[PDB]
A = this chain, B = another copy of it.
Amino acid sequence: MQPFDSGHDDLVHDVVYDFYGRHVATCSSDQHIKVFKLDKDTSNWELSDSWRAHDSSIVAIDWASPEYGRIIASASYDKTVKLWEEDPDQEECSGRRWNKLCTLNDSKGSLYSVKFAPAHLGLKLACLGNDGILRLYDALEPSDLRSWTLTSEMKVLSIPSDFCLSWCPSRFSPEKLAVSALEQAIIYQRGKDGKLHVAAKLPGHKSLIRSISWAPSIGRWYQLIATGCKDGRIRIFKITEKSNLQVELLSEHDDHNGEVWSVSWNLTGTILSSAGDDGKVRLWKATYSNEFKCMSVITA
């Protein structure tokens, strides 16, 4: 496994795998979004297309279920999110390979993270800004991938900083989204009235929460969501749903001695990864007792 030049002139922020894990979409402070392709023949990655996406620094990215087309979404410090439908009949390395399906100017403050809701709910997406306001967009009509409406607009809290969020993958559980603002982590669920509500919180954080992601509850009903905190501790919670949610603290690991920056899940929720200051990446597996044990560690 050999690295490769992202090609970015300024520090890189997010890297997201498309559905089939064939491509990865980069994005950094150089205001450019880059999609790379994994060559079937040679095990090498090569730039599919780079192009100025936003005017300020870009920080988040996420693809949308191939059942809705090839739509990469992006958020930036320019206080606005942009969508991009890939143009199959184009060139590569050109810059005319992706178009602004639209632009979400509503956020009256710099955005930090945007993720597409699970496909079974439709073509929806959430995004959290610095104004501490959650915003849910969705092209009510899948045919015109250009007009997105404002579903919900909840406000988290004050702005005296780090953010991020992750929906609940499981297609067989009532819609819900977990958002984390600073030293907080709150779970939201859809109501009988079709409006969002605060279903529970993940207690225990002492510093800002660098990363949080929900896990694919494949084969199980109890949900699982991991936390990468600034204090240097990974946390795995077990949310069971009988107010009707129970939040359990399963594990907790300091193994990193620094700050947990990125915490990520397997595609079947079998493995969990944790990266931090100690420049190492630990992967975790679950026990029959459901406590988490690290299986391996990569370094630098």
* Distance from A293 Cβ to chain B, minimum over Cβ atoms (Å): 50
Binary CB contact string for chain A from 91 to 123 against chain B (1 if under 8 A, 0 otherwise): 100111000000000000000000000000000
The 8 Å CB contact of A52, one of B51, B52, B91, is B91
Measured between beta carbons, the chain B residues less than 8 angstroms from A52 are 91, 94-96
Q: How many residues of A contact B (CB 8 A)?
A: 6
Copy total for this chain: 2
* Distance from A287 Cβ to chain B, minimum over Cβ atoms (Å): 53
In A39-82, the 8 Å CB interface with B consists of 51-52
* Distance from A232 Cβ to chain B, minimum over Cβ atoms (Å): 41
Measured between beta carbons, the chain B residues less than 8 angstroms from A95 are 51-52, 95
Measured between beta carbons, the chain B residues less than 8 angstroms from A91 are 52
Binary CB contact string for chain A from 22 to 52 against chain B (1 if under 8 A, 0 otherwise): 0000000000000000000000000000011
**Separation of A52 and B95 alpha carbons in the complex (Å):** 9
Residue of B nearest to A55 (CB): B91
Measured between beta carbons, the chain B residues less than 8 angstroms from A51 are 95
* Distance from A48 Cβ to chain B, minimum over Cβ atoms (Å): 15
**Separation of A52 and B96 alpha carbons in the complex (Å):** 10
Measured between beta carbons, the chain B residues less than 8 angstroms from A94 are 52
**Separation of A96 and B55 alpha carbons in the complex (Å):** 13
Residue of B nearest to A91 (CB): B52
**Separation of A243 and B139 alpha carbons in the complex (Å):** 70
**Separation of A96 and B98 alpha carbons in the complex (Å):** 13
* Distance from A47 Cβ to chain B, minimum over Cβ atoms (Å): 15
**Separation of A95 and B91 alpha carbons in the complex (Å):** 14
* Distance from A57 Cβ to chain B, minimum over Cβ atoms (Å): 16
**Separation of A51 and B93 alpha carbons in the complex (Å):** 11
**Separation of A52 and B51 alpha carbons in the complex (Å):** 13
Binary CB contact string for chain A from 178 to 214 against chain B (1 if under 8 A, 0 otherwise): 0000000000000000000000000000000000000
6 contacts between A and B (CB under 8 A): A51-B95, A52-B91, A52-B94, A52-B95, A52-B96, A95-B95
| Nearest 4 interchain pairs by C-beta | A95-B95, A52-B94, A52-B91, A51-B95
